[PDB]
Symmetry: D5
Subunit: 152 residues, 10 copies
């Protein structure tokens, strides 16, 4: 059985990307954004075609991402930030709701939203993953933007 397999497309030329960065544990999101923007340029995304906004924390990602997607000016969005466990169930609540809103936005608007929100126990874990997750989200935004076009 040899069906049609759509080959992934990582060509960023012409894409419009939005990025919302939660600033809680700011050093983490900044490292993610530096890696993220850098990778987007590598993929061919124009610097003039990227908007970056920031919010206080991960629970504010939903409302900001929702607007940018509902504008339909963007082929794909990226959510950045870090939830680091402290002393309370607040970690579970934030991790759960921020990810759930990122899922909901992509389903209801058709705009892919790369989920680059870390959910980790320690500062060191977030530092170890920051740059990697940032560049990954750049590749997710580009690829899924192109995949959404093929399916419209």
């Amino acid at each position: 059985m040899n069906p049609y397999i759509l080959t992934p497309d990582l060509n960023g030329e012409g894409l419009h990307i939005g990025i919302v960065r939660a600033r809680f544990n700011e050093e983490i999101g900044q490292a993610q954004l530096q890696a993220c923007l850098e990778e987007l340029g590598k993929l061919g995304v124009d610097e003039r075609d990227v908007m970056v906004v920031s919010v206080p924390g991960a629970l504010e990602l939903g409302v900001a991402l929702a607007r940018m997607a509902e504008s339909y000016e963007f082929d794909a969005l990226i959510a950045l930030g870090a939830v680091i466990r402290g002393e309370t169930y607040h970690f579970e609540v934030v991790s759960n709701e921020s990810a759930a809103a990122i899922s909901r936005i992509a389903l209801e608007t058709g705009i892919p939203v790369a989920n680059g929100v870390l959910t980790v126990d320690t500062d060191e874990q977030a530092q170890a993953r920051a740059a990697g997750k940032g560049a990954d989200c750049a590749q997710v935004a580009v690829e899924m933007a192109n995949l959404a076009a093929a399916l419209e």
Copy 2:
């Protein structure tokens, strides 16, 4: 090097209209949160004539109250205050989960940012230690996100 447009955060509260719903379970906690919240709003330049404060019995009632205030579209941003403090039963998880989920749902479905200032902690001492800080935080979240929602409309 990549130099895109970065929208600078705007913490100017002049002219903003804020609604606040305070869950009263563990009342000393929410009262401290509201005292810190109102004070910080003033520091940010929000007029006291432009702030409405209502209260509900507990965190599970935040959803229905916040839903009305948002759907009226009289408010640029909302704030939820309160404290879920673990006792002896899975009720702690249920309340923490559902109140936070409704705060999330309201912001997404109406476009009105809702700062989530409901604590979810194991002990009274944890709630006391975080009350004032979380109140002031919610002041800066409401103001900042109110401006961001306008800038993206």
Copy 3:
């Protein structure tokens, strides 16, 4: 000094119409909750001719019953009663989670406040210790939130 408008809570039940859905699983518990609830509503000034009480097998059936009562808009506020008591399986988590989630959803989507009086406890004794208190609590939540919904309605 910042002094905003503070809407004062209103616990006057005169004229309110309240619906109550009582899950019958662990029936002794819900019956005790309902006895405390009705008594407190009367104390708050709710007319007994303005209270409707229905019952369902268990907490997972509360969603559909409450959903109908709210969508009729005959009620100013609703109350959910019952008890999920942990046994031997993850069924406890499932029931606790889903019944509370439906109570939340109904209030959000219809604007009708729904007091959540469904206990989620490990033992019969915990449910007995909490039954009457939670019942009266739900009475005060229904009255207060019914009035708050009025104050915020166009």
Copy 4:
């Protein structure tokens, strides 16, 4: 004392139309549930010519099947049967959670009561001990909630 109107439960199945979706994973369990369920329905007065039974591979497929049967509005109430038995992985939580959540969502959005008869247990023995009881329970739930939904319309 306070004496309001108490709607007494009605377990008369005469004339009701019932749909049943049986998940077949751990087939011995769902089959045993269905035997108890159909028997109880008959005892309650439900006509066999007014009952439809379909089956799906597992509990995660219950949502889509139940969604159609409810949206057809040929049925006064539906019943979901099956068993999620913990193995070695978080897959147990995933299936338990989603199947139950979908059963909830269908009942809320269509008004058709859906009895949740999907067991969520750690061992085969737990499922066997609960099969027949849960089947008959779901029969009584479908009838009662079908009549209650009628009384509120």
Copy 5:
């Protein structure tokens, strides 16, 4: 009691199937896809009626499956991939959200979506389940496509 029992139908002739393969832990999804396609052919599905696309990870399944389903080019969909626990709560988040989106799409569009995303602690667990889960999802997609047809007015 002998009611109407709709018999399962595993005839894939004429069915149109979409497959979204998450590539995180790529060896797993590849083994799932080989097993899946092989089983579909065994059931009589034409290769000219199957589309396969891939996404980086399980959190991208939602948006991809959503478009394919809303196009109504497909009688049923299949999600493949593997979430393997590492060091952080990210495992729970991904397992939870990917499964919830697969559930949501099937409910809101009526298109069955076979959930073939593994949620396991170790690579060895994923390797042991890969092929089996791929073929299972083939049988689920075919069966549910036929069940959806039987229930479409």
Copy 6:
């Protein structure tokens, strides 16, 4: 192939001296265990005049009583009976852990085998289902290990 000496288990109770300490917390359970235990001992050939039965308030008191009976060396093997049923607190873990650990320590330090028949369950129903079986099991364990300890001396 490799064929070593395999000591075959010996379940002949003739002539053995058995001690039994019955914890009385959740008395219905331990009483039911003891009825099954004494019966099985008789079936195995143990003389009733060679069995001693004592009882203590709860599982945490088993250690000191069993310690004396073993240190007297009047008994070839001992049996501990009782039931720890989870309630509302970490007390369940504490009792389960210490009673079992003491049963282990006594057998190691004195050489007298101690059958552990203390259930550690979440619910009364679990204890009831396991009572008789665990009683007879402990009877077979006492006899077998008594004979094995003799064979090694």
Copy 7:
């Protein structure tokens, strides 16, 4: 089968009891001690044969009980106090170590030690159990002192 059954003996006349009361959450241990002493008197224990000492917390019970037991001035000992969960794993550590030491002392010295240390999540749980646990420990100390005598050559 009718074996020799040593009947429990709750006659406290002539028994010598030592009591070590941990003072952390002092209200709890005080209520336990009032209930405990009252019950001992009811059982016939002379007040001139009871010694009560106190330590700061449950981790100091071990060394105090150890000395009193090794003196062999006491027929049985009683440990009172309460570990109430706060914000950290310290709760498990204290509950675990205090109970393990109470177990170890009784095994190594032969002196029964009633474990009356509560291990609970909340102050309310400790208050609800305090008096009951105090009286229970009285009955355990008396009964086990008599049982130890019956088993002493």
Copy 8:
């Protein structure tokens, strides 16, 4: 560069005397473990005339049996076999913890190495997947540690 004395592992079983205690709960598992164990010992050069095998009802009885065999000092090393498979209760934790603790204690207090081949798993399939491997592993542990105890004995 630091080069100390490294004692090389010694897997020669010639002349060793091995004892094996097999818990029979979930009997198919322990039987499979023992088949793999005996086979590997033979491969390592252990004489079958120098191996003793006894069995106990369950893992909680391993302590007392192993204790006697070690205290006799007829054995250079011992092996514990069996499987604790989680069911419905905390009994799984208790048995897993106590059987391993006794295996540790016996080796520490007597100097006789005791290979721990008691599985502690959630499902029958996990135990089947691990049975033979763990059996052969325990054979190599018994031989190797028997020789290491000799190299460190006065």
Copy 9:
């Protein structure tokens, strides 16, 4: 019923106290020791009668405390330090074993050992508790030293 109740005695005059401080998360044990020594002086303990030693981490407390107790030069010992959860089960192992050894030493030698080893999830929790636990352990060492005398 009015039995003999031994009244607690917090008079430190003449007592000999040993202190073993685990240095992992050093700032914590130092704050504990500053509060601890200060309280001992308040209770009447001679500065010339206190020995303070330190070990790398909490798992080394057992062997050091064991020697000092087996010398029988000390009326009571104090263990200080902090186990702060990171990313692994190492937290449970260290918390469990360090506390278990502190219990074992006191039982087998008769020398009370105040357990001042924190077992917490975050640096902030340890900072909040350091001084309190230090002074508490001083009062535990004094009181239990005096209690051991009455029972010899």
Copy 10:
């Protein structure tokens, strides 16, 4: 101000004799630990002619080996190296707990300090990240505690 005698840590390894037992399960990990450990010992001044290194199959075998080396009293301090990496079963807890407990018991009962360098981690990546550091740490622990044991003898 209180100025007592503070014994200064002594990290001078000249003349010390160290034994090392390396568990070989996940061999790459223990090998890296030993490479870092030996190097740091040299930095501290320990003669290579005064170090013995042996290896065992896994962490559960560390106890019996370490016990001999300590009881010979040829060594001023010991070091245990290895890695317990969680897989699919409660075996991870058992091994982590028992090996650490034996390392503790040996040091207490023989007086020979034993640095515990056995990792207990969820993933291979965690073990790799900590190997070299933990090896060097154990070098400084062995040296420092060897000197402390002498100073207190």
